[PDB]
Amino acid sequence: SVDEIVDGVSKTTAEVINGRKSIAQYATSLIESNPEPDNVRTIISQPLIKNTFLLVGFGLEKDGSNINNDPSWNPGPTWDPRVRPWYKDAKNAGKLVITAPYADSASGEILVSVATPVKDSATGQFLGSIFYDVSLAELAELVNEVKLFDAGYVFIVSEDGTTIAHPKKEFNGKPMSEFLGESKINVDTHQVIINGKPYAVSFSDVEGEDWYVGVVIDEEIAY
Amino acid sequence: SVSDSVDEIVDGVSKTTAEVINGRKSIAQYATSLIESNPEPDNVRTIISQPLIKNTFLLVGFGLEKDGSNINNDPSWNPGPTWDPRVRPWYKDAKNAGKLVITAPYADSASGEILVSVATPVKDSATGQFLGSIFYDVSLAELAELVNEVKLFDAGYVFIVSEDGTTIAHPKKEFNGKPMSEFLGESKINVDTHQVIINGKPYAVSFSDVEGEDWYVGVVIDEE
Ligand SMILES: NC(=[NH2+])NCCC[C@H](N)C(=O)O
Numbered sequence: 528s529v530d531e532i533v534d535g536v537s538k539t540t541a542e543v544i545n546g547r548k549s550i551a552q553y554a555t556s557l558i559e560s561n562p563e564p565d566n567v568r569t570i571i572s573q574p575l576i577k578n579t580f581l582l583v584g585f586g587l588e589k590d591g592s593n594i595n596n597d598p599s600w601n602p603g604p605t606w607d608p609r610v611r612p613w614y615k616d617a618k619n620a621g622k623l624v625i626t627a628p629y630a631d632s633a634s635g636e637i638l639v640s641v642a643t644p645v646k647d648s649a650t651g652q653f654l655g656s657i658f659y660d661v662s663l664a665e666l667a668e669l670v671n672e673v674k675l676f677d678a679g680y681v682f683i684v685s686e687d688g689t690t691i692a693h694p695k696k697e698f699n700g701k702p703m704s705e706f707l708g709e710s711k712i713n714v715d716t717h718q719v720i721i722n723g724k725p726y727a728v729s730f731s732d733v734e735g736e737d738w739y740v741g742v743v744i745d746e747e748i749a750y
Numbered sequence: 751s752v753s754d755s756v757d758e759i760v761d762g763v764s765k766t767t768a769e770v771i772n773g774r775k776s777i778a779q780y781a782t783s784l785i786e787s788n789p790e791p792d793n794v795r796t797i798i799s800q801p802l803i804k805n806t807f808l809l810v811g812f813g814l815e816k817d818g819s820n821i822n823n824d825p826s827w828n829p830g831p832t833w834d835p836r837v838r839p840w841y842k843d844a845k846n847a848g849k850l851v852i853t854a855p856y857a858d859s860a861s862g863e864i865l866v867s868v869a870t871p872v873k874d875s876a877t878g879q880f881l882g883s884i885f886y887d888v889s890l891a892e893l894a895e896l897v898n899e900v901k902l903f904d905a906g907y908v909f910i911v912s913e914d915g916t917t918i919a920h921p922k923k924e925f926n927g928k929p930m931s932e933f934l935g936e937s938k939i940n941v942d943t944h945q946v947i948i949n950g951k952p953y954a955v956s957f958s959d960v961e962g963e964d965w966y967v968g969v970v971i972d973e974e
């Protein structure tokens with residue numbers, strides 16, 4: 528039953544996503560414990576962090592300076608972290624948040640960031656925000672790793688149908704109607720005609736985020 | 751074709767199992783790196799007592815070479831001096847390997863349960879002096895549950911063994927640490943899919959090595 532397949536895929540998706548959240552929150556707590564620049568570098572420049580996220584950086588409220596874990600990239604004349612969506616989202620939320628999809632400053636690629644505020648341990652005053660960049664391509668690939676029927680794919684949307692992750696990276700950050708036709712989420716399994724063929728499409732909410740995972744399966748193989 | 755099919759099932763479980771074990775390894779390595787960077791007691795306490803660490807492992811402890819003292823992330827565990835971490839298997843394994851390693855199954859000091867531990871040595875950043883070892887306790891029951899959750903075939907189960915057939919994780923906990931011959935009646939690993947008779951009924955059995963360990967995932971599939 529498709530509902531059972533997509534319900535199982537949402538469980539996995541949550542684990543994938545919650546794993547990234549847990550690591551991001553761990554690094555952020557250790558940083559809050561002692562936000563000395565050298566301790567921040569040590570915390571974010573370990574293999575675990577460099578292998579989980581595309582890039583990690585701490586932007587400072589005081590002066591728009593930043594500490595990050597890729598020496599190859601230093602921000603140009605231009606770049607002020609304080610103007611970036613991950614910065615503001617974490618500051619506004621005052622706790623760990625994941626951004627909507629947006630275009631990365633350097634590459635233009637569509638991504639999301641796990642973002643956390645950093646508060647002064649003593650005062651409680653906002654010092655800045657940390658971003659943990661997440662690859663949507665890798666995300667799509669992960670939630671598509673174990674598939675049961677080998678005739679379709681898994682995707683992730685926000686509640687308004689904005690694509691978070693699709694196997695084809697060209698859909699990331701775009702409305703899901705670009706590959707489903709329909710623009711609003713119909714959670715219940717239903718038939719969608721694509722290219723003249725019938726597919727069963729079904730969604731399941733992702734615990735902890737305002738995302739759904741969706742499934743698109745060729746019916747003649749699906750059943 | 752049926753042999754190829756079962757082959758693909760154990761391979762799939764092997765891949766997922768490797769991803770999970772490497773993930774836990776990476777987390778232990780990270781923490782060990784942060785501790786090594788600054789092993790002051792309060793910094794160690796701060797590093798190992800976070801939710802990420804308490805949720806990934808059963809228990810985490812840093813035992814010291816100097817006096818056999820320790821810092822662990824379980825506030826209700828306060829072993830007295832008859833618990834010397836320096837004589838424990840995980841401690842010696844970490845010291846011997848000089849890097850991250852996973853133990854063979856052994857009996858836990860407190861519970862007597864058979865578990866394994868991720869183990870890492872810690873060295874003085876400046877002088878290279880050996881300071882002690884950290885253990886990261888892994889539930890074998892939870893491993894058996896993990897590799898059996900995704901089950902494509904009708905009836906049967908999944909298990910883990912070392913290269914010489916020592917059981918790492920079986921759905922039935924009493925087999926943990928035991929030779930696999932106790933539930934397979936074979937003592938040597940035959941990687942290729944092959945028929946095994948167990949209590950009169952035939953089963954398909956097959957193995958796939960786990961990347962990063964000399965472990966194999968095994969499947970026992972009823973041939974109804
Ligand atoms: N790969 C990079 N160097 N990215 C730099 C930009 C960092 C962050 N994702 C932003 O857009 O603000």
Ligand SMILES: NC(=[NH2+])NCCC[C@H](N)C(=O)O
Nearest residue numbers: 809827838857858859860887
């Ligand atoms: N749950 C516990 N308090 N275990 C204490 C023992 C720690 C470690 N597994 C050992 O046997 O040395």
